[PDB]
Amino acid sequence: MKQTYMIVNELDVNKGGMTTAMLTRSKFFLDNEISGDIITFDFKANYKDILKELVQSKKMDKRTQMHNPFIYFKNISNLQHKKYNYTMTRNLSNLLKDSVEIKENSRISRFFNIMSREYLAYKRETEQETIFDLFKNNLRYKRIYFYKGKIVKTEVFNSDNNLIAEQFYDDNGYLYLYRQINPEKKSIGKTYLVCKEKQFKNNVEFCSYFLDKLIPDINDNIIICDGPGSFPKILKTNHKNVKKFAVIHVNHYKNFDDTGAVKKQEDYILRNANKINGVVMLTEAQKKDIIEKYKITNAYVISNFINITDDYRDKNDNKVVGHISRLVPQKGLPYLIDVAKKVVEQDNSVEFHLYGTGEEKSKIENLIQESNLTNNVKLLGYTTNAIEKIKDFRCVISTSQFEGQGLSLIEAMLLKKPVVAFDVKYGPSDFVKDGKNGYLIENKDIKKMANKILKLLHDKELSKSLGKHGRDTIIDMYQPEKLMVKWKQLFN
Ligand SMILES: O=P(O)(O)OC[C@@H](O)[C@@H](O)[C@@H](O)COP(=O)(O)OC[C@@H](O[C@@H]1O[C@@H](CO)[C@H](O)[C@@H](O)[C@@H]1O)[C@@H](O)[C@@H](O)COP(=O)(O)OC[C@@H](O)[C@@H](O)[C@@H](O)COP(=O)(O)OC[C@@H](O)[C@@H](O)[C@@H](O)CO
Ligand SMILES: O=c1ccn([C@@H]2O[C@H](COP(=O)(O)OP(=O)(O)O)[C@@H](O)[C@H]2O)c(=O)[nH]1
Ligand SMILES: [Cl-]
């Protein structure tokens, strides 16, 4: 059969759209007898626990398998020996000996060797991990990570205490991977596969080698790169039969610059499209604006898969607007608070429950405290069950200045929730119908946005009516079957 391989850098629990899309794609693919596997390229010792929380939170299917070079090559290295080395362990144990344990807390302890005349070791024992920071002339140079009673990773630092090297040990206690880190360019360098005595100059080469080994060169195998920064690695593979599809998950134009400048990562994908089997966009709007200045004759408008959650009893009894997304400048949080003050000026009972985590938490909280919006606009944090949160909403807002498909708004519409969104490029201009499912407002038009929110917070009847149309809107447009037939077409 046809086996697919989704490409991304990392897969954590507190993520956004791309992640949910890939995992929903995988589930629907696996329901159509098409294998859907995710290929990550990061070191996470707790990857099993993360993926287990993801499948338990109904974010990932059980039949989805995640691939990682830090696991693949670790397993190969575990086949090259038979017993645990315990040599590195014995080294640290003997260095902690002839030294005096000076414990600050019940977790943090120091070690003073009278032969070394100084503190040459620090320890932080937690419930699951034990850290050993080594010191020389009061300067940290090494960090020994112990996870599940086994040395898993070691870090070498410099005089400025910047990472310059990273080492990865296996389950038999043997180093299989060594990495050099440029502390000035904050980048990865010489990657050393000790298990195969190989040498790479970049993580790109190492990950390309991983994909060349994990994925055989067969025509019934296909690589779907959804991450724009993982494209280079997939392009430099020695595959001549494996199909390669790239997916643009966001506006291909510079976030702010309206000069028509394109993002390096996205430009790279859209420029090297003659060397891949095709590029998949979500909106026809993106396809058109990309066809211009690229002349790519391999563009596809296959949209993202959205789980069509079952219907429920929405009474719309709570006056609460919601924005479940990353706290990132992508979403115009400033403009949101500038509209929430207008809403509260009329109805001071309307509450803006914002969900998600990010970097602009402090910024939004400052604007919330600057205004009297402390009891109105409240950040609650990342939600593993957004479905429940949206079920207990009235409307969903969007103040984004750039976006892709817009999963959070589509899910809201599918949960019979009216959506008022800023008309944005390559985004909600394809599913938000002004008057039918919600109100499409001009970008940076606080007045109109607030007036539409007000109408819905005072007419619960119209809210339910608009929401009903929103669910049917998604079902008609983004039918899982329809999207799968478009994917199967590109596959065969
Ligand atoms: O040594 P090498 O191997 O060369 O490694 C290079 C290194 O930079 C790699 O870590 C990097 O290439 C990562 O590769 P990926 O692109 O495959 O990883 C994607 C991953 O990482 C994020 O983007 C990355 C890409 O810029 C950021 O360097 C992360 O710091 C970021 O964390 C995440 O996209 C996914 O792991 C999680 O996806 P999500 O579901 O949480 O987020 C939804 C996604 O659609 C959303 O993040 C995008 O809409 C972001 O929009 P952008 O406009 O592309 O990002 C804003 C800015 O970062 C850039 O525009 C700006 O830096 C450049 O103009
Ligand atoms: O606390 C959060 C915040 C976001 N999301 C998910 O993140 C996605 C948001 O995707 P969208 O396309 O709106 O924005 P992106 O993250 O792609 O920029 C939706 O599927 C949400 O379910 C979530 O589950 N919990
Ligand atoms: Cl042996």
Residue numbers in the entry: 1 to 492
From the paper:
Staphylococcus epidermidis expresses glycerol phosphate wall teichoic acid (WTA), but some health care–associated methicillin-resistant S. epidermidis (HA-MRSE) clones produce a second, ribitol phosphate (RboP) WTA, resembling that of the aggressive pathogen Staphylococcus aureus. Each blade of the homotrimer contains a catalytic domain with a canonical GT-B fold, consisting of an N-terminal acceptor substrate-binding domain (ABD; residues 1 to 68 and 202 to 302) and a C-terminal nucleotide-binding domain (residues 303 to 492).
Extensive structural characterization of TarM(Se)G117R with donor and acceptor substrates, in particular, with product uridine diphosphate (UDP) and glycosylated poly(RboP) explains the binding mode of poly(RboP) and the catalytic mechanism of a retaining WTA glycosyltransferase. We used 4RboP-glucose instead of 4RboP, did further refinement, and concluded that our ternary structure represents a complex of TarM(Se)G117R with product UDP and glycosylated 4RboP that carries a glucose residue at the C4 position of RboP2 (4RboP-glucose). Four interactions for the phosphate group of RboP2 in the binary structure are present in the ternary complex structure, while the ribitol moiety of RboP2 contacts the side chain of Glu10, and the glucose at C4 position is hydrogen-bonded to the Gln265 side chain. The phosphate group of RboP3 is fixed by two tandem backbone amide groups of Gly16, Gly17, Met18, and Thr19, and its ribitol moiety is hydrogen-bonded to the side chains of Arg326 and Gln330. The observed geometry and distances nicely support an internal nucleophilic substitution (SNi)-like mechanism. The ternary complex structure of TarM(Se)G117R bound to UDP and 4RboP-glucose provides, for the first time, clear evidence that a glycosyltransferase glycosylates WTA in a processive manner.
